[PDB]
């Protein structure tokens, strides 16, 4: 059904195509389109996906693409436009294209959010007669059997406990197994106890190095997602806790929101990718704490605020403008879900009133998430000659002042750990908070 | 129809078993024809794969089999049992099971050959109801598209000439590229060509480093079919010469046969791999001299040789019993084929009488192919007090001894290339050459 590319429809059409990734979707598909004397423009999230195309489609097939990043824009004059997403709302959006290819549309990255509902928001009136939704990944996908994998649950005998079950030492004493944690701290206390235990163990997470893994020999190799980008092959096993770390918003009260990393338990892309680290070329097992639960394509409100801020931050979009964008995305089906905060976020956004230009910029380019909430709760700070939260890195465009920052925090919302005494009086706080009760789907 | 298991004959059955590496036909199948109160014998090429099976059948299913290699027989006196072709031919072959599974019985290499006829001699006579013959990879398979890698053919257009055609130097500048050459000798001369030209170029075969090779940024890798054994993952396009290495076998009259490593079109087998070098999580692009022209499972008479010579030196048969073993196996339909050249092989080795014993446990020891020919032809030169046809390793049992060897080698046949002066005067190469000539195949 959405597995061949869509015709062009002589008026306007929005179409889903459901492809593997690699198998024509995002080149062979908009060569097509462009041979019959279409313009295309086709998005991805991935700087490097989005060069990646115009490496091949030149080898390939001679076709030079024009290939639009952050870093730099190539204009080459053809027919087809290759950008990512946040390239894409730094240019003002549909402002030209025939056809325009949101490529990987269940992504739930805001960048991805935010550009898709433009596209949608923006293509008919731009003079586009075709959108494809296009993904490999399509929303509500569970994790389905592999023919080469042998899946068993962990139960409660075993000698090692993890994560509420436990795993005999038989099963990964001798051979090569991958056990997943959901923390840098479980793989080095893991790898700790196991290690006491007679077994070669050895952790790795975001910034060691690749070669702390032996190429040969038995080992059991405790490490976080942070493997599956980093590093190559292998593995007898994967033993998977089932958890993750998330970006979550909690409506904590304390006065206002909380946005932090916490612990969820996994969605099935999480499963899938995790468990496809055994059976490469050979048999493999898996084993599991809990059986697949969460399908892929629901995200978190706080990448709706996530829209918010980077509409405020980087593309001089209000916060309304922000909300027809992302109404047009909730009101398309078959694309990734969220609870409807839209206007409670664009509410809380409309009021974050003179923010310091200064502070923005510099939480622009030091990259922290959030800059327009870090560097807006900042502001407030060095308005009132008070500390920030915490002395988190965060906060540093803060940190030249520190000398003359005195008293409690006056405490808008919450980013991580609080680490200062805080005031709830500040009028920014009571705005926020009557954000919250003002709306229906949040109080 | 040969994707199923399978079900017990209740007196004799031969059947195929067509499913893909890792999908349960080498584990799976034996434990559910164990739990029905079956003894089941496993067959493979490989210790590695022998010993993974027993790693995965344990760890899985609490299942311990029996494992046998050339290294150590591992007893559980369990009801599978899990051995190479060769441990199996040296144990004795059938001599126990109700069940036996040849698996990757495609395979040409000579114990598999061997190892399976022996199977399809004995198997019924020692009270085996059932043997499947099963594989990844079925005789007379071809390269078949993949989704995920577009195929484009060289022309004579390009600046640098390739097996008869050309590159394009615009094809290989710029992103990350792999060229299969046939030999160590042609990877050195392209890289050196190529780096001349402004590319960053480098050469891998058997005995070079795996980090020889960058894990990031432009590279052009000239390699050999080493790579996919030695190396793990990438490539933006496979640039493919199309022929490889093989043993054959010439009956080059001067005086009798040549076996050597000589240049042969490729297989689909060797055309699968070393396309499936790109493509990877991406598009890829694949180039070829020439259409794929060879299906898998064809091979060598030279191989029916090392199959009478393994026999000899290996495993106490006879040349005749050699060919009851040979004859079942070219009896038996759904198999790789060869020319029938078993009763002039049978007669050559007949008459291959006296080896000295001790030159034959030093060339078994020192793993040189065909151990027999070679000791044999070493016999006849010490007892012609003659120097060998060379100084190549291979002879180098008659090392201790060349300073009284002297005069013209007595050639019995070619094992390499020849370095000395020759008579043809020895009653065993007249035995050879009446051998051929009194073959109506083989003239
Ligand atoms: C650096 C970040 S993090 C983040 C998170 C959420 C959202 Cl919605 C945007 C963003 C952005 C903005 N952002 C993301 C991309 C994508 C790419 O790498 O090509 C991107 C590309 C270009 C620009 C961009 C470039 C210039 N010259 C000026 C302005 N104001 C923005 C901003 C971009
Ligand atoms: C070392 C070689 S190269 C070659 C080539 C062709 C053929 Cl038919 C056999 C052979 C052999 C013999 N060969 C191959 C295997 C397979 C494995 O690794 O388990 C193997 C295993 C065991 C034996 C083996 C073990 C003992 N103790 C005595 C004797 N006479 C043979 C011989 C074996
Ligand atoms: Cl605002
Ligand atoms: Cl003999
Ligand atoms: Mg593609
Ligand atoms: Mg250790
Ligand atoms: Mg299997
Ligand atoms: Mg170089």
Redesign the pocket.
Known sequence: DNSSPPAVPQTFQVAHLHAPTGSGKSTKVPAAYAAQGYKVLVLNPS?AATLGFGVYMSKAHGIDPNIR??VRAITTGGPITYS?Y??F??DGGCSAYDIIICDECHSTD??SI?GIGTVLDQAETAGARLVVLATATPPGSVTVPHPNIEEVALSNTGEIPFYGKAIPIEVIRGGRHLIFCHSKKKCDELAAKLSALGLNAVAYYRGLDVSVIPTSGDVVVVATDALMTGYTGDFDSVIDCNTCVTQTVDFSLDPTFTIDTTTVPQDAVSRSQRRGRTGRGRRGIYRFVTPGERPSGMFDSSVLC??YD?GCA?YELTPAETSVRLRAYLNTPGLPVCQDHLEFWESVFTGLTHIDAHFLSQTKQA?DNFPYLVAYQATVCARAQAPPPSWDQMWKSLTRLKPTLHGPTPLLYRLGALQNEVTLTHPVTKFIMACMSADLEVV
């Open positions: 700087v990043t952050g990512t946040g390239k709302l730094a805001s960048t935010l996530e829209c980077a980087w990259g």
